[PDB]
Design a protein around this ligand. Structure first.
Ligand SMILES: N[C@H]1[C@@H](O[C@H]2[C@H](O)[C@H](O)[C@H](O)[C@@H](O)[C@@H]2O)O[C@H](CO)[C@@H](O)[C@@H]1O
Length: 296
């Protein structure tokens, strides 16, 4: 319908947005290293954990972009990893949560970014991209439409954001040059541009400025429908309680949340964050979702 109050239902917040709006133009909360929630070993948690809750908790809190990092096993299935570590979560496991969620909330869409996080186990029969495409993508939940995907065509389906090469099947967002630890801008699909801020290995200070500056560039280019803006608030670092992603996010999330709160912008972009929870105020994911009041 037509009320900003509808953006307040985290489970169906995309319901009020017009079908004609390109997904790119929508401000969307996302989660970084989404599948790390099962990590229980203290040392592993410090070095790799970025989320405390599962996929379903994540989507019921408004997150629509999932950063999935896989690895081809001998058994010829794709499981989730954080570098060399297996996360006790599988790709099927993710797809099924997304399927259930999209069934209960058919107004929504889920964007799934897929990246090959580690090298294929030695005995696999096919390549990573090939297994993914013949064994999973082929599933009807995957949108096979490319171009500047519109919200209308996406609802009820999972939209792929390829972060792997060798893709032979058309659909979703195509792979694009993604340089290490920087903020950049290039082109995707056919004519659309993309600017990404992914300075994952920098100082806190440099990070907050990188986020704000990319966010500024976004709110100032609010009507450029064919421009993707992906902005990672996540930052990784050393191995101690005052250096871990949890420590940083406990600062970065409320800081960016308020930053959006006060600027009252029309466009915020795709904001991928660590630790989507309900501890810090204001809520980053909620402020990002509210920057959509202008589309209603
Ligand atoms: N960790 C490997 C990975 O880096 C990741 C970051 O860790 C972080 O999660 C970021 O948000 C991702 O976008 C980024 O891709 O990919 C690089 C490819 O150049 C490798 O060299 C690195 O060692």
């Amino acid at each position: 319908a037509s009320s900003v109050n509808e953006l307040e239902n985290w489970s169906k917040w995309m319901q009020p947005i017009p079908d004609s709006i390109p997904l790119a133009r929508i401000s969307i909360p996302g989660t970084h290293d989404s599948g790390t929630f099962k990590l229980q070993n203290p040392i592993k948690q410090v070095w790799g954990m970025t989320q405390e809750y599962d996929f379903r908790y994540q989507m019921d809190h408004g997150a629509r972009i999932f950063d999935i990092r896989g690895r081809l096993t001998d058994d010829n299935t794709i499981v989730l990893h954080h570098g060399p570590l297996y996360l006790y979560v599988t790709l099927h496991e993710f797809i099924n949560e997304a399927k259930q969620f999209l069934k209960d909330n058919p107004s929504e869409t889920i964007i799934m970014s897929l990246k090959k996080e580690y090298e294929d186990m030695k005995g696999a029969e096919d390549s990573f991209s090939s297994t993914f495409e013949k064994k999973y993508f082929v599933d009807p939940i995957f949108l096979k439409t490319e171009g500047n995907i519109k919200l209308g065509d996406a609802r009820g389906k999972i939209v792929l954001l390829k972060r792997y090469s060798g893709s032979n099947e058309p659909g979703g967002y195509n792979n694009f040059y993604w340089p290490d630890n920087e903020t950049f801008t290039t082109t995707v699909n056919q004519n659309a541009n993309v600017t990404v801020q992914d300075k994952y290995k920098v100082s806190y200070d440099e990070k907050v400025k990188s986020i704000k500056d990319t966010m500024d560039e976004t709110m100032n280019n609010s009507e450029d429908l064919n421009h993707l803006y992906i902005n990672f608030t996540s930052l990784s670092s050393g191995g101690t309680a005052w250096n871990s992603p949890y420590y940083y996010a406990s600062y970065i999330n409320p800081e960016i949340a308020n930053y959006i709160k006060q600027k009252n912008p029309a466009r915020v972009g795709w904001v991928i964050q660590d630790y989507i929870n309900e501890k810090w105020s204001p809520l980053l994911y909620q402020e990002v979702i509210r920057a959509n009041k202008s589309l209603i």
